[PDB]
Amino acid sequence: WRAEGTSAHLRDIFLGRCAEYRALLSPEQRNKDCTAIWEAFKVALDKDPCSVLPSDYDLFITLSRHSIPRDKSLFWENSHLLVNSFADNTRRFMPLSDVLYGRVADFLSWCRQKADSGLDYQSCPTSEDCENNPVDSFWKRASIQYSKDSSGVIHVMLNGSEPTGAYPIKGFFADYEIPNLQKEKITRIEIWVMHEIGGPNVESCGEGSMKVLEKRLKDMGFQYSCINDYRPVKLLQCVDHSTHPDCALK
Amino acid sequence: WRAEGTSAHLRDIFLGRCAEYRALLSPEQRNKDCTAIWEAFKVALDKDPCSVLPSDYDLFITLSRHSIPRDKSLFWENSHLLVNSFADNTRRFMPLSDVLYGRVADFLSWCRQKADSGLDYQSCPTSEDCENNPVDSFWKRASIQYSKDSSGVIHVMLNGSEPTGAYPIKGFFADYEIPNLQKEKITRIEIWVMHEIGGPNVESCGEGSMKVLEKRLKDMGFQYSCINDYRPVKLLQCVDHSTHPDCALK
Ligand SMILES: O=P(O)(O)O[C@@H]1[C@H](O)[C@@H](COP(=O)(O)OP(=O)(O)OC[C@H]2O[C@@H](O)[C@H](O)[C@@H]2O)O[C@H]1n1cnc2c1ncn1ccnc21
Ligand SMILES: O=P(O)(O)O[C@@H]1[C@H](O)[C@@H](COP(=O)(O)OP(=O)(O)OC[C@H]2O[C@@H](O)[C@H](O)[C@@H]2O)O[C@H]1n1cnc2c1ncn1ccnc21
Numbered sequence A, B: 001w002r003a004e005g006t007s008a009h010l011r012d013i014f015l016g017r018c019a020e021y022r023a024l025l026s027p028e029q030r031n032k033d034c035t036a037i038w039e040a041f042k043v044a045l046d047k048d049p050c051s052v053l054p055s056d057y058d059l060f061i062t063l064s065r066h067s068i069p070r071d072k073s074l075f076w077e078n079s080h081l082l083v084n085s086f087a088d089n090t091r092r093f094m095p096l097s098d099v100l101y102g103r104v105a106d107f108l109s110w111c112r113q114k115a116d117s118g119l120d121y122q123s124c125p126t127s128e129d130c131e132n133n134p135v136d137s138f139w140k141r142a143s144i145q146y147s148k149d150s151s152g153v154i155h156v157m158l159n160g161s162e163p164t165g166a167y168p169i170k171g172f173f174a175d176y177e178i179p180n181l182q183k184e185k186i187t188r189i190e191i192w193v194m195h196e197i198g199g200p201n202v203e204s205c206g207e208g209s210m211k212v213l214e215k216r217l218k219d220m221g222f223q224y225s226c227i228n229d230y231r232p233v234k235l236l237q238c239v240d241h242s243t244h245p246d247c248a249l250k
């Protein structure tokens, strides 16, 4: 397996994150059983590391699913850390990592040993090793759910400094979220194409892969919008480049 | 009593955070036993909620203590959330909440029931109910250690929009940290007086309580400097006031 093995102390981390997230939920939907959620989740830890399907996580989703506030969904690509810091633990936006079923697995890795009941802390399969590995099947299932439950203004943060372009035609956003957006309950889609401070401007709104994305969203009937270096996020990037000319204040 | 009852699912949260923090420690001191750390901490939970002393957490500290990088300490008052966001989980600085023993308790509450053996989720004592409550004694002990183990350039974030003054003459910083800073291994102390965006400038460097703090530190023989609205932090505050004139980019 050419990927990170199971995360040490997966269970404690999972339950801890789950318990802390409960506090963020509204009292009405605060009734969540972290233990049951973990049990449902571990069904994948009792299977062949190449025989886990997205549907295997259905129970896990049923037990953890909760509503996402209108206009708070934030999708992204090649911007993990920035998205998490900007979202600020649900305070500004609620990306998948800030939704219960996403929060418990953010950054973690897991898979059962090839031919032994115990978890494999040595390595886990990538899409290359095999399509149906625990981690990818999990995110496919969580992505679909996250997309289906989003409504209002859809925000998307992309990385215009990524060498392969801002929009990966083969990725979770393209293959599992866009096709699952409920057109009827979506007002518009606003894209933020961020560039590293002084970093390379590989692509901006309307260029390369951005034209492909825009065309698709438009052919799908969505009201489309694209902003280069959305200020609030630029200001956050600037925190680490205070003396740079792109970050100077008036 | 008068304070919040112990946090729901305290143990799970505690262990979860402990396990996640282990990953941030260098392989040299990563060998931490969260369960044992939890048991040492629990010693205070099996005592009268008004008879817990800072020394009751000596074992807890012994088992969770670790080094703090030179120049990375960050003290503060009236800016807990700003400090946590800026520190960015160990990336930029290492405040007490980003040190193992502080991390497991950041924002939590705890105390045993008055005459019962179980935890009291209804309420916990405050400084007014009785001085020796579990939470206050915990932070006194934790503050002392954090100070004793700090070195190099000392940073301090104060709130200059605080009505009663940026430097509370009575508080954890004045009463438990400053007295435990070890000059022999300290270069200088740098203060950052932050003001709310547009917010009121109650006090700035060299004003009111700031006069007191400066004189106290100088009388102790420390090199001292103060900065109003330290740029990096100002930029972070700006993320939520992007259109405000104080946050306009050049
Ligand atoms: O370690 P773990 O358990 O694997 O958790 C993963 C993993 O540790 C890390 C991957 O970073 P990467 O730069 O490859 O970033 P990606 O390309 O993988 O993320 C882009 C996708 O996330 C979305 O939110 C966007 O809209 C888009 O669909 O982000 C966590 N992660 C958070 N949300 C997702 C996620 N991994 C797959 N997802 C799929 C969906 N939502 C996710
Ligand atoms: O819920 P919990 O478990 O009680 O966790 C507490 C509590 O939930 C919250 C209190 O916010 P407050 O504005 O009153 O701020 P404070 O006056 O209480 O804290 C300011 C002090 O922290 C330092 O780091 C600064 O340099 C300064 O000495 O911050 C958490 N906290 C984190 N570090 C500390 C802490 N509480 C007391 N401390 C004392 C030391 N380090 C701490």
Ligand SMILES: *[C@@H]1O[C@H](CO)[C@@H](O[C@@H]2O[C@H](CO)[C@@H](O)[C@H](O)[C@H]2NC(C)=O)[C@H](O)[C@H]1NC(C)=O
Residues within 6 Å of the ligand: A078, A079, A080, A081, A082, A083, A159, A160, A161, A162, A163, A196, A199, A200
């Ligand atoms: C946006 O994409 C750029 C380029 O892929 C990322 O910056 C690179 O990050 C890697 C790993 O940290 C480094 O090895 C490269 O040297 C970086 N290149 C450049 C030009 O900076 C950047 O981290 C991405 N931004 C976000 C928020 O994920």
Ligand SMILES: *[C@@H]1O[C@H](CO)[C@@H](O[C@@H]2O[C@H](CO)[C@@H](O)[C@H](O)[C@H]2NC(C)=O)[C@H](O)[C@H]1NC(C)=O
Residues within 6 Å of the ligand: B078, B079, B080, B081, B082, B159, B160, B161, B162, B163, B196, B199, B200
């Ligand atoms: C700095 O201190 C100010 C003043 O106490 C804090 O602002 C107050 O915050 C409370 C709670 O959110 C509000 O009800 C008040 O209206 C605020 N007053 C003002 C003048 O803004 C502020 O939160 C503190 N800053 C930080 C980072 O903690």
